[PDB]
Nucleic acid binder design. Structure first.
Length: 43
DNA sequence: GTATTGACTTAAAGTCTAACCTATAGGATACTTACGAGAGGGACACGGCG
């Protein structure tokens, strides 16, 4: 229902392409300090 | 007047040095989604017949 409409809106054209880039970047969330330390040690 | 040579001075330039541009890098608290009509053609929905 509501989640179905969410998934339907997840697949739209978005001809602006800045809105498309924003919906693309919306996929990945933030991180906090300890995982930053872990990533730095790994790299 | 028209043919010369021998000095005699003069304005215009290759090269070394200095400053003034130019390409380039760097700069740690933590901050995470802007602001009219007029006609033709193609695509999506809905209903009809075998």
């Amino acid at each position: 229902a509501l989640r179905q409409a969410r998934k339907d809106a997840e697949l739209t054209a978005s001809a602006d392409s800045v809105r498309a880039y924003l919906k693309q970047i919306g996929k990945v969330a933030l991180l906090n300090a300890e995982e930053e330390v872990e990533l730095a040690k790994r790299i």
